Design a binder for this molecule. Sequence first.
Ligand SMILES: N[C@@H](CCC(=O)O)C(=O)O
Ligand SMILES: N[C@@H](CCC(=O)O)C(=O)O
Ligand SMILES: N[C@@H](CCC(=O)O)C(=O)O
Lengths: 414, 415, 415
Amino acid sequence: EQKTVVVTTILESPYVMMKKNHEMLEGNERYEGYCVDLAAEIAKHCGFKYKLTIVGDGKYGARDADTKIWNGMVGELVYGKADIAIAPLTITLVREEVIDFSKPFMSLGISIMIKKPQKSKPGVFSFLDPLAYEIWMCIVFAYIGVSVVLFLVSRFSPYSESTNEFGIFNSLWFSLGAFMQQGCDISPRSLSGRIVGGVWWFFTLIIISSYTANLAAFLTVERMVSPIESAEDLSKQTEIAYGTLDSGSTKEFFRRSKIAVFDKMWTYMRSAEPSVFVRTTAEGVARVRKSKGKYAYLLESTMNEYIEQRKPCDTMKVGGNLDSKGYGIATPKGSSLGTPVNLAVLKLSEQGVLDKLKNKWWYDKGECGAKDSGSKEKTSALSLSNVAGVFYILVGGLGLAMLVALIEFCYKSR
Amino acid sequence: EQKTVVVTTILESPYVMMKKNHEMLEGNERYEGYCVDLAAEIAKHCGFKYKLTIVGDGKYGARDADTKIWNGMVGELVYGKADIAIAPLTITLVREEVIDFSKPFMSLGISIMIKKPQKSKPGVFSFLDPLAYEIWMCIVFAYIGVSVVLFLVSRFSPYSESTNEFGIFNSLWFSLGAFMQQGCDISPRSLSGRIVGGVWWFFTLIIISSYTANLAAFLTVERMVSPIESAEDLSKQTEIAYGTLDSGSTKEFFRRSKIAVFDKMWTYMRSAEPSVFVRTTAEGVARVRKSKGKYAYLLESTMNEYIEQRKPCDTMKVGGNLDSKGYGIATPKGSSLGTPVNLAVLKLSEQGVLDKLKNKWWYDKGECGAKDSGSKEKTSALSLSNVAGVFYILVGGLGLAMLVALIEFCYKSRA
Amino acid sequence: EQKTVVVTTILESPYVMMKKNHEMLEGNERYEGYCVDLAAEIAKHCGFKYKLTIVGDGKYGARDADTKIWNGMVGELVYGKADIAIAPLTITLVREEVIDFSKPFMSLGISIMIKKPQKSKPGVFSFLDPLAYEIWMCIVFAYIGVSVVLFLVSRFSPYSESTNEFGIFNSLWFSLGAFMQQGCDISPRSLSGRIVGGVWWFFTLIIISSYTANLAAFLTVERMVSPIESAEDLSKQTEIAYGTLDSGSTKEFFRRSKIAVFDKMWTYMRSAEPSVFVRTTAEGVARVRKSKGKYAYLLESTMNEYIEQRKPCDTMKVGGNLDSKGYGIATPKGSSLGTPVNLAVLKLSEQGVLDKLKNKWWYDKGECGAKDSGSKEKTSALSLSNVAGVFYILVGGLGLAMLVALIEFCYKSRA
Ligand SMILES: N[C@@H](CCC(=O)O)C(=O)O
Ligand SMILES: N[C@@H](CCC(=O)O)C(=O)O
Ligand SMILES: N[C@@H](CCC(=O)O)C(=O)O
C-alpha cells in the first residue's frame, strides 16, 4: 500500500516558510520553500505519497555528552519517528555513524557578518589627491633647483655691472609666478637665462595639463574605510565580541579544531560572558543589527548570501570561506529509500533543476541596490563641503601676512 | 425580399466612434469611423443593404470558464444573433475552430505603455549650474577680504608714504585681474604683499580649474535609461504593476504561452492583488496616467500609437512588438459570404484604399509628431539659446559704463 | 595475510607525476604526487600493503559506442583488473550505476581557457604620444617661419632704423613665449607685425587646446574587452575553434545537456572539421598556446588554476564555473573495502589534511606568482614613473645652460 512517508524538516528561510494564508489553507499548502520544491521533485521521481511534519523542538543538535541520548532531527531519524529528512543538514562524521546520507546537492562554507560601515565624505585636503606623494616632493625639489640655477647664471659680475634685476628673492618670485601660470613683469633678457626659462615653461605646461584632467571624479569618492577585511583580526583584538549558533555543527567544528587561531577563538567563546550564543539565526541577525556593529556572528554562507538580499541590507559578508561542507538527504540506516533517493539527487543535479530552484529562491526576491547599481550617473553641481578645505589655507595666509607685517613694522621703527 | 444584413461591432476608438450629433441623428448616420467606411466599401463591392448594431455587453469575448459557452461578439456570431462582424477581432487558433476569418487587413503586435518622463528645459543662466549657489556666494566675501587685506598691508608706514602704488582701487583691480587669469600690469614687492598674492593665486587655480572640469563633465550626455525594450525588465522587478484587458486575446496569450519570461509575467498577473484588469481600454489608459508611473498597461500596438499621435500626447511608447497577429472580417461557418469578403479585402488591399483610410484616422492629424523622432547623437553643436545669458550681461555692462562716464563728466564739469 | 591491494591511476599533473629519478629508482618510489600522499594516508589508516600501477591506455574511460563495453580506468576496475582506483575520477550518473563512490574529496567546475592578449607598458616619453609624430615635426618649421617673417617685416626701413626692438633674437623669444601661452614682454606696434602676431595667436589657441583635450581623452579608461566569457563568443560565432578532451566526462556532458547554448556548442563541436579533440590535457594546452589565440580548450577549473601557476603563465582563465561536480575514490560494487574508505575521507576532510596537501601542491610551489590581475578602479593616481621623462629634460636643460654660461664668460674675458 502507498504509505505516506513521514517527512521531517525545520522552519527556516528560504528553505521552509509558512505561507501567509496559513490561517485559511490546510495540508501541505501551508508550507512553501526550496526544500518543499525539492521534496516534491524527489517524491515525483520516486513515485510515492508523503506527509509533511515539523521537528518537535526546532533543533538540529547532536548526541548529548555522557548520556548518548540523540535529539533533534537526528533523534527523530534514529528512533524511527520519521522516514526521511529533507533539510539543510550538514554532513559530518558523527552523523554518518548512525544515519546514511545521499551525495551532496549543495556546497557551502563558514562565513562572517558585521554591521556595514556606511560610506563617508572625502577628506579636507582631497584637492591634492590626484597626484602621488613623491610627485609633490620632486616638484618642490625642482622648484628649488630652478630658483637657484637662475640666480647663479645671472649676476655673475664679469670683467660695476648691475643691470640684471634677478636677485635671489626676485628669481624665487619669478619661478613661482611662472608655475602658477600668472604673468610677470621681468624676463631673463640673456641667452642662458632664456634657456633656463624655456625649459621651466615646458615642465609647467606638461605638469598642470595632466593634473586638471581628472578633478571632478576625485573631489567626490563616496566609498572608503572598513573595520576589517581578512576577518583574521577577530582573533587578535577583543573590541568586537562574536559567537556561534548553539546545538549546531559550527560549534562542534570550533570545539574540535586544533588550528591555533580557531582554538584561541573557541577558548574565548567558551568562557566570555554574558552568553555570546543564540538559539535561532534571526535572533543572532537582530542582535548584530542592534549592537551597533560591536558584535559579529558566524553563519553558513548559504544564509549570508540571502540575508544581504533583503531590506534594510544593513549587514554584509566579509572574508573568504574557512572550509567546505555539503548538505544531504538523510535516511534511517539500511532503509530501502537510500539508493533511489541518491539516484534521484544525482539526476536532479545533472538536469540543472537545483540551479533553477536556486535562482527562484535567491535572486528573484532581491530588492536592495546591490542587484543593479551600475548606472553611476554624474553627480549634480559641486557642494561646498567638497571644496571647503581650500578656504581655510586662504584665511590662514591672510592671518599670517598681517603678523609678518606687524613684526616687520615694530622691528624697523625702533 | 432578401434578409437585410445584421452587422455587429464594438464601440472602440478610432475604429467606431459616436457621431457628435448622436442625440439628433437617426438611422445609420449616428456612427462614423474607420470600420464604418470599410463597411461602406464592402457594401458597395458586394451590393447589399445593411443595418448597424452595437454588441450587447462590450466584450470581444472568448470561451468561458470551461463551460464551453461563448460570450460577447463571438457568441453573437456563433449562436445566430448576427450575420457578420466588422471589428478589430484578432485571429487566434481557438476562434478558427468555430468561425471563418478572411485574409488579414492589418498587422500589429503586443506593446507596452507608460508615462512619458518629461522633457528637458535648460534655463537662461544654465552655465552657472556646475557650481552650487553657496560657492558663488562665499567667493565674493573671499574677493573682498583679499582686497582689503592687501590694501591694509601695502600702504603701511614704510619707515616715504608715496613709495607704493597699491591704493584701494588698484588692489581691487589687481585681485580681479588675478582671479580671471587674464594677466596684470603690476605686482607687489613687499614680502607681506607677496605672500598674500601667492595664496590668492593658489586659490584661483584650484577654483577656475574645477569649474572648467565639472562644466565639461555635464556636456557629455544627458539621458534617462528607461525600461529596456521587449519589457523583460517587467519580469525582474515588482516596482511596476501591470495588467491586461478582461476577456481579450492578450490575456489568453499570457495564460497559454510557455515562454518562461511570459509565463513568469502571467504567474505575477494571475497572483497579484488587488485585481489589475480593466473592462475598457479607456480605463487602462486612465490607470496608467493616474498611477504616478507605477503602472503599465499591455495593449495592441495599433491602439497604442493612437494614444500618442493625438492630443494630449502625454504618454510614451516603450519597446517593440512581442509577436505578430492580424485582424479579420469574420462570419458564421454557415454562410456563402466567405468568398466575396475575401475577394473584396484583397481587392481593397491591392488598390491601396486601406492605406488611404489609415492615413485618414491615425496620421492625418499628426500634430505632435513634428521633429518628435529626435536623435541619439552625442556630438550636437551648441545652439545660441544656450549662451544668450552671457550676451545680455555683456550688453548691460556696456550700457552701465556708458552711463557712468556721463555723470563723471558732468561732475568734473560742475565741481 | 593482508593480500596486496592492486591500486590503479593515470599520469596527470600534479595528481601523479614521474619522479626525477625514475630511471634509477625501484618499487613504489618512482611515483610522487598529491594522490600518492593521499594513498599513503589511507594506507596508514587501514594498514594494508599496496602496489601502484598505471592504467594501460591513459583514459578515464566511458561506455563505448552502444556496444556496452567500458574502456579505460572504469573498464580495468569493473572487470577485476584492479581493486581500487585513486584518481580525479568525476562522479557521474552513468558511473554510479556500476561502481560505488565515496563522498567527494574536492570540488570543481567546468571552465574555459584562452591565450592572454599580451600587455603594453608606457614608454619613458609616453607624454608625447597623445598628439602625433608628424605634427611635432611640422610645428618646428612653423615656428622658424613665423620667427623669420616677423624679423624680416619689423626691421624694415622706417622711412630711424633704431625705432623698433624686434631684432632676430627678440623675435625668436617672442614667438616662443607666445606659443607657451605664458605672456610676453612686448608686442609689435606696426600693422604688418600685428597681423603676423594675430595669426600666430590663433594657431596657438587651436593647437594647445586639442593637445590638452586628447591628452585627457586617454586617461579616462584603458581596458581590452577580450573574448566574452560564459561561452558567449564561442556560441555566437565560429571565429574561435574549441573542442573537449576525448573520452571524458565533459564530452558526455556536452552531448547530453539540453541547455540551448550548450546544445549549440555541442552541435558545433560534433560537426566542425578537422578533429578538434585531443588525447591529453598537455596536447589541449599546446593547441591553445600555439594557435595564435584562435583556439580554446574546455577543462576542469582545478586544472586551469594550475596552468595559470606554471611557467611562463601566459594563459588566462575566463568566466566562472559552468556547473558543480566532485571527485571520489571508487571500488568494485559490493566489495567490503570501501565502507572504511568513506569514513577515512571524512576524517581527513575534518582534520584539514586535504587543505594542507592542496596548499603543499598548488601554493607552496607558486613560483609563477606574477599576480598581474590588477584592478578596475578608474581613479588611480599618477605614479612618478609616468612623469620622469620630464624631469630628465628639466635637469638636462639646466645643465646645458649652466655650461653655456662658462664659455660665454671665457669668450667675454678673452675677446
Ligand atoms: N547545518 C548545520 C546548522 C548549524 C551549524 O551550521 O552549526 C547543522 O545541521 O548542524
Ligand atoms: N484584439 C483584441 C483586443 C483587446 C486586446 O487584447 O488588447 C481582442 O480581440 O481581444
Ligand atoms: N575529470 C574528467 C577529466 C577530463 C575532462 O575534464 O574532460 C573525467 O574524468 O572525464
